[PDB]
Amino acid sequence: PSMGTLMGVYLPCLQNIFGVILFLRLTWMVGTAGVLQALLIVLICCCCTLLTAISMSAIATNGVVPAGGSYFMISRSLGPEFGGAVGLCFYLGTTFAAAMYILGAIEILLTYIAPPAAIFYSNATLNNMRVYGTIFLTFMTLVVFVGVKYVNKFASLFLACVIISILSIYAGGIKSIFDPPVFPVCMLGNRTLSRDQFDICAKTAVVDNETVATQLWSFFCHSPNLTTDSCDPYFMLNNVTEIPGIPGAAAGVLQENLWSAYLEKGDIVEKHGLPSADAPSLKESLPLYVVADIATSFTVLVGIFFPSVTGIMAGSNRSGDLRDAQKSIPVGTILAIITTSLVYFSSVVLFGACIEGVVLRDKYGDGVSRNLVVGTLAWPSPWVIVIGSFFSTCGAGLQSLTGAPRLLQAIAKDNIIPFLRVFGHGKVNGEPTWALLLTALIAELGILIASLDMVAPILSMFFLMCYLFVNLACAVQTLLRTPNWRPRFKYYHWALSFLGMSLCLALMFVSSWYYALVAMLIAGMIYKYIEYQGAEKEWGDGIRGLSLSAARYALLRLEEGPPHTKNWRPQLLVLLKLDEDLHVKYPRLLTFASQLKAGKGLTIVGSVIQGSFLESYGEAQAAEQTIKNMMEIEKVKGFCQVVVASKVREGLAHLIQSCGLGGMRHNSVVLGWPYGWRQSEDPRAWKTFIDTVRCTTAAHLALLVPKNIAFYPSNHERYLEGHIDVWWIVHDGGMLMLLPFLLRQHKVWRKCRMRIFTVNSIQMKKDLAVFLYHLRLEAEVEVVEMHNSDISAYTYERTSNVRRMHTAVKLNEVIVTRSHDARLVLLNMPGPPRNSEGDENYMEFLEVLTEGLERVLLVRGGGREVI
Amino acid sequence: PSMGTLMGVYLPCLQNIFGVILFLRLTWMVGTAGVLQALLIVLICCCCTLLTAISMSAIATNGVVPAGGSYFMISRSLGPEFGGAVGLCFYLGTTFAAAMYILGAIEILLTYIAPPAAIFYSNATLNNMRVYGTIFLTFMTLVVFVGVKYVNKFASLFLACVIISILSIYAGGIKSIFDPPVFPVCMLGNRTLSRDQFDICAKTAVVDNETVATQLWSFFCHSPNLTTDSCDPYFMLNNVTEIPGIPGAAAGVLQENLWSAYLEKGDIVEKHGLPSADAPSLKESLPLYVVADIATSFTVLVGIFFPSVTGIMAGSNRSGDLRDAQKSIPVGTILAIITTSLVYFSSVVLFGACIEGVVLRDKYGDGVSRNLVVGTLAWPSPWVIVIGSFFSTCGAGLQSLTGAPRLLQAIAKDNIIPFLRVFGHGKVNGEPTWALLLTALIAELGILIASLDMVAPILSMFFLMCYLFVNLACAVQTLLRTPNWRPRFKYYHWALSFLGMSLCLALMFVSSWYYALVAMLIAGMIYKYIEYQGAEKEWGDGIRGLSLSAARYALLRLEEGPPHTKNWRPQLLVLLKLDEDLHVKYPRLLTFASQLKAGKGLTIVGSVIQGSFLESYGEAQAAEQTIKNMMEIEKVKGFCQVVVASKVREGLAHLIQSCGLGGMRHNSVVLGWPYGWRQSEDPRAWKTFIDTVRCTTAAHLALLVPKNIAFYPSNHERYLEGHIDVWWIVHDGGMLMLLPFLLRQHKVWRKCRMRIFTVNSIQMKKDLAVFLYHLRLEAEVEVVEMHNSDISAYTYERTSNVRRMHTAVKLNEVIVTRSHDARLVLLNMPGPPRNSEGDENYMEFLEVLTEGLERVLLVRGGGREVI
Ligand SMILES: *[C@@H]1O[C@H](CO)[C@@H](O[C@@H]2O[C@H](CO)[C@@H](O[C@@H]3O[C@H](CO)[C@@H](O)[C@H](O)[C@@H]3O)[C@H](O)[C@H]2NC(C)=O)[C@H](O)[C@H]1NC(C)=O
Ligand SMILES: *[C@@H]1O[C@H](CO)[C@@H](O[C@@H]2O[C@H](CO)[C@@H](O[C@@H]3O[C@H](CO)[C@@H](O)[C@H](O)[C@@H]3O)[C@H](O)[C@H]2NC(C)=O)[C@H](O)[C@H]1NC(C)=O
Ligand SMILES: Nc1ncnc2c1ncn2[C@@H]1O[C@H](COP(=O)(O)OP(=O)(O)OP(=O)(O)O)[C@@H](O)[C@H]1O
Ligand SMILES: Nc1ncnc2c1ncn2[C@@H]1O[C@H](COP(=O)(O)OP(=O)(O)OP(=O)(O)O)[C@@H](O)[C@H]1O
Ligand SMILES: *[C@@H]1O[C@H](CO)[C@@H](O[C@@H]2O[C@H](CO)[C@@H](O)[C@H](O)[C@H]2NC(C)=O)[C@H](O)[C@H]1NC(C)=O
Ligand SMILES: *[C@@H]1O[C@H](CO)[C@@H](O[C@@H]2O[C@H](CO)[C@@H](O)[C@H](O)[C@H]2NC(C)=O)[C@H](O)[C@H]1NC(C)=O
Ligand SMILES: [Mg+2]
Ligand SMILES: [Mg+2]
């Protein structure tokens, strides 16, 4: 399968864009709104479609392109929810478009081709439209049922007819510039008379050597004798002129019809710039003037014109039979859009500058003798545009009735929405069976309105909803960094899709707010229903399934990307120690964690249970429930893991290195202090502690070792007088300065004074102060003398056993004489020794250091802390 | 702190609800819209506020009630995002309400109290309103700045004045029924003359024994002599009547003014039911008829009336100083609402049935000699209502200017929105300083409009937005089962909150669609900004923080509730085996998992690395990256865990029992088969396999042991001819029937025929078929003979070593002669023995069973499978 860009993307998109709105409703729109506002309408309606084409190209380039059609790409690149919601709005738009094309062909048949055939001679026109539209819809449905092959064969002919029509229009204009046609329109003062009835527009004619009243007189004056004075004042007071209706292109005409002329329902189409002496008038004369049919505005014209720029999704419709789709879909679509936009602009200016401003406003060509107003300027004859538009409308109706059921069948066989499974019951060949009937029924329900000017806004609403959803999906997926979404289009940026969504939403609300609300509610309902059904199909439950799907999506999206945050906040893993009877030994660790997190962040609570898994599952479940209850009491929102190991050491290690799912990992381990390690003889008291410390420093995790956890305050407790003391010695400054702030952020330490003690002094104070300004703690800074010999233990261990104890006891003396009355004391601990045997000496160091302090918390940095 | 329900909730809510709209704009609304549509407006505007009061009660009962005010409850019970968004709309509503009350007091001062004081004598009224409103706003701001204590002291007086006003109105009506007042209104045909200028309404009066033209003549006719014929035709053609303006209560008047009388801008207030002979008229007479001031409709009246039922959040405003708030806030609020609604209904009917339908439509009381139209019926004098409404408006303005800056200061000190931190810089006493200035500026910007009929819809938009957000939050949090949200209100149901949200949204869009769009965009912007800032504060990054917060919220919400799903879908844990050089040994396990999941669900991929953590972290990270790449290649979306253990057995156990976060856990373990176990001498080949099997059967997890994994198809492979074979023997029927369906759902097995082989036969076939109908697989069912002796191994092991082999070899013979050419064969495996030593015999059994089959997959149920 291989066909080029032109005959694969360009010509189908062109054939789908050029429609009936141009012939039947371009001149009327231009005359009612002027040339300027018409150009503005065309620009506004082309910008939304151009931004949507850019977003569609960004969709069509990422990855491989599915070979099914234009609905499979959207789904594959935006998810079943979005794609399903988009597909239904597009289906409804297409079926209503079929209805509109049938209505247009009926109007062209009953008004210009053969008026005598109308059955009903107000509401007679509406009933004729209803009857003939129903007959046409039935026959077209039968044709599509039996003869799809001939339609696909003859589809080129309709495009040939459209192109020949446009060429003839432009040839007629260019011939108009130097030698225009003749189409006299008659005038009464500054009113417009219907030339259909009268033989000639003249008050009196000379027959048999004398003057006699003409048909215009007998129609306006009921008396057939000139010597009468019982007629309306407007006829006798004003003259009767015959101005040419097609003045050749000039700068005087384009200057005349350049400003808006919005009429009201029932008003008279008047030629601004003719002498008129006002006077009352009878009520038997109104059937002789041309009348405005519907109320005209700006939003009305926007709504009526928009369905003439839709069809940009028809270019990416032979995706399977394409040579290189990534390079052939976007360029073809955008070139088709540009060609259509330039043709519309040129045609607006040409109509404005070539035709009278009073014959453009005859929606049905009443001033002229019931001709196609746009067909008046055409070189060969006004008969080429009539037949051309008739065949174009028939072909567009046939193609819409062919392409809507196929899309419905695709959506039904995709098994997204479950209640429309029957609509996928295709024939033996694949041609839909019970989707054609539903489509014909919806098209009939649309035909029953029987007025293009009322069917067009619904069509516009559905297509605008589809475009808005495509744009919004693209922008959001680009912003939030979805895992499988990376488009390769060059001229693409999420700002463009966002602007397109905004513009098409503005249009959707300008046309009719209530229709837009109904469309938005339908779209939201289908989106949520697709999401719920997908959740129930993946997991098993509806609501819990929704939560599981949201969690999985967030974790998967969070997986990709740089795994480092610009800031550092403690996300703890509280290693609780269960008793022999499975009771929490130190329930104050959970309280302290709740005070340090304040209910925001991640807090996992692990614990190891010695034994064997094969025979100890119930114990694990019971302990998990116990920890969950104890954790609910202390008001800390977190998860709870319980593992059953053979030795507690390896259980602790596995718990430290494996807790979380992907990016939701901990980065801080808060373990308690071993009590009675030197009292008892069992050496294992302090080996587990040292091993967990060494295992949490090799994973680059922070460390919080709250000593004397039995004296820490509870949540009901409150502090009124007291001062936190910080004793940052050398390293770990960031966290030593960030912990007391996050601590005092709690009501228990809501107003505890902070004092920063740091073992040129003025320069150091200035730096600490400038750093504190960003934090805003403003705690008093007191820098005591720094003796390198005393601090040689921290410097030597980071980057002499007898000396170690000396320095630790001198440091302890200083801290206990200058910080004894402190509420909470925070100081950083030195790293454990490299030699696995000096652990006793390291423990003695750590014990003699914090001698006397009532409550002391030791923090060890991980090294990856930034702030 | 303890005060009752009445003086703590009822009276403040009552004082906040009864406003100026009732006096200044009740009669006008009733006359323009009739009695029926007025009652409908009151009902529509009371239903939204009643449903909002029910939702607010449901909020006020769950948990403890914060003692701060009415904004802390909403925040504490709905989250910082919702509460912050609600607080700002409420602040804007309150400040614009202050503007409206100042405008009302100005109107009452310049129109009835003292008209000569107006500075400008159209736009003179607007300029007078602007100047005087600015002066009033300045003086009121200064008073609130200096004298809050006196305001809080005197707040009771304003309620006393309002109550006395209403009592006087009703006393006047009841006195009207039997002896009404005198207020003659003059008429011209069926037009309404302004009685202010004329001395008496009579064409001619008799002075000095003869008739002379009266002031009405000289005002309507410029000639002061009766003998003139140069006047307008309407004056001479019609009469001059003097009808009473206050007809006592009767059923004839309530019948007259019962249908709508919507006028247009500039129309004349006409008395339907008086003789009038039409005629043209001059243009110097229009300043003498009463005129309609603004265009009236239904939506206009809805918008103008709505700010008279707002203030239901003022009852829950002394939460701290309450005896028992859970029982005192809801009953008080709802009783205040009911009292206000009944007073409005009774007043609408009383006005309709007591006053002429032509003097109700004088917005400024022009027909009467510039009196308060509602003050005409009042027993003591019309002077009590004027002064009462003046003092009420002044008091309401003062209280709004006192209560808006306090709310802004609370929001600013809560540190939710960061850019308004300055507005919390209260005085030494707490009274706001730079929040009062901002509030006064916004109120001035609102005063510059200087028309109640244009300020009221903005107020309505803000309050409706606040109410809609409260209702939506309540309904959603009740539906999705938020963890900390359980209200105790009896008459509360999420359907009521949903209906309230719908009704108040309908109102918000009926009044003015564009205003509603602006309000909704403001609310959404503030919601998303609060969410982003909170994410950046909890975690550290903006976008990644958003993802982390969504994941944590979903997991926490999913934690609570029954942990069993009605359906069972496999969520796998693929235990890969890494090589000595850290390469995936069997990369086909990942392919098979991707074919069985099809990219939807949870798939964790664990692996154990022997060694020691203290010295093997880089190996773990490298292996994790390797597995991530290999898993991305095979197109399976899952997480990857790597642990470093000392012995692979306990690593596998810890991986089996601890993988996931809360509810996102696996329920199926897919491990491979040990190859070369009998070939090599190392006994550990089959001990790890048996141990993992026994460890995964004690955790109640399913088990998938794909044998001969080297012959399984790849993703590029396709199958055209072949038939899946199922050999369900006794147990594990649900999963043995669900696995092939989920398998064939993949394109690789898209059309492989399924054959169900099952070792009364007709009854069994009928049951299997009925079960298959729901699945819809419709696979052919062939039931072979079931010999109990051969099946004695499965029956004896679930619920003789020589016999075991016999039965296994006979079963293998049957399966290999009737299923040799099968594509994939699925049969359930028996459980491992209880005796830890018969493992060799169990392995020999499992090996001799699947002898000859090219591809065989064995499944073992967990026992908790439902479908
Ligand atoms: C077509 O002829 C009709 C009827 O002869 C013209 O209607 C009349 O046009 C004159 C302007 O030339 C209007 O006079 C102006 O009226 C406005 C508002 O009343 C006033 O402010 C101006 O100072 C001036 O008096 C006149 O009202 C209008 N007649 C009616 C009944 O409205 C019409 O303008 C002619 N031209 C068109 C339609 O382009
Ligand atoms: C107040 O007096 C005014 C002027 O005298 C009345 O206006 C005129 O009322 C009559 C009805 O009694 C209208 O006649 C009707 O007009 C409609 C539509 O044109 C027609 O369908 C009916 O068959 C009938 O002819 C007349 O049009 C109207 N005059 C104008 C200029 O509109 C008015 O109705 C009196 N009563 C009120 C306002 O309650
Ligand atoms: N079985 C366990 N499960 C979870 N965490 C543990 C376990 N054992 C120890 N820990 C962690 O190590 C810390 C040190 O406890 P450790 O057992 O060393 O001291 P102890 O229990 O107070 O008594 P001793 O020091 O005499 O053994 C505990 O607070 C806990 O954080
Ligand atoms: N180190 C490991 N990490 C993760 N999973 C493992 C590990 N070792 C074994 N397993 C699991 O157990 C299964 C059995 O593998 P096992 O080592 O028993 O057989 P083998 O490697 O094929 O060779 P042999 O049977 O001779 O040892 C593996 O497929 C895997 O699922
Ligand atoms: C009606 O048509 C006539 C014919 O063109 C207009 O012109 C008038 O012709 C008479 C004949 O001599 C002259 O006396 C008048 O002076 C002409 N009018 C002007 C303005 O020159 C006539 O004006 C038309 N009437 C109206 C109301 O347009
Ligand atoms: C104007 O007022 C008079 C006084 O009430 C109306 O009544 C007419 O009075 C004259 C005096 O004899 C009678 O002849 C007429 O028959 C009375 N009218 C009727 C209907 O009985 C008079 O009708 C008023 N005019 C209008 C237009 O309402
Ligand atoms: Mg120990
Ligand atoms: Mg082994």
Numbering used by the authors:
A (entry chain A), B (entry chain B): 116 to 236, 244 to 881, 887 to 926, 1014 to 1081
Copy text verbatim from the article accompanying this structure deposition.
Potassium‐coupled chloride transporters (KCCs) play crucial roles in regulating cell volume and intracellular chloride concentration. They are characteristically inhibited under isotonic conditions via phospho‐regulatory sites located within the cytoplasmic termini. Decreased inhibitory phosphorylation in response to hypotonic cell swelling stimulates transport activity, and dysfunction of this regulatory process has been associated with various human diseases. Here, we present cryo‐EM structures of human KCC3b and KCC1, revealing structural determinants for phospho‐regulation in both N‐ and C‐termini.
To gain further insights into the structure KCCs in an activated, non‐phosphorylated state, we took advantage of an N‐terminally deleted variant of the closely related KCC1 transporter (KCC1Δ19) with deleted N‐terminal OSR‐1‐binding motif H/RFXV (residues 3‐6 in full‐length KCC1 (Austin et␣al, 2014)). In both structures, TM7 and the cytoplasmic halves of broken helices TM1a and TM6b of the core domain (coloured in orange for KCC3b in Fig EV1A inset) are peeled away from the scaffold domains (TM helices 3–5, 8–10 in wheat in Fig EV1A), locking the TMD monomers into inward‐open conformations. In line with an obstructed ion path, the KCC3b‐PM map does not show any densities for cations coordinated by highly conserved residues of the cation‐binding site: Y232, I148, P443 and T446. This interpretation is further supported by density for a putative cation coordinated by the corresponding residues in the KCC1Δ19 structure without N‐terminally “plugged” ion access path. Inspection of the electron density in this region of the KCC1 map suggests that either ADP or ATP are bound to the Rossmann‐like fold formed by β‐strands β1, β2 and β4 and helices α1, α3, α4 of the KCC1 inner lobe. Combined dipole charges from the converging N‐terminal ends of the three helices and multiple side chains create a positively charged nucleotide‐binding pocket. Weaker density for the γ‐phosphate indicates that a mixture of ADP‐ and ATP‐bound particles may contribute the observed densities. LC‐MS analysis of denatured purified KCC1 protein confirmed the presence of ADP and ATP in the sample (Appendix␣Fig S11), nucleotides that are likely carried along from the cell lysate during purification, or introduced by the ATP/MgCl2 wash step.
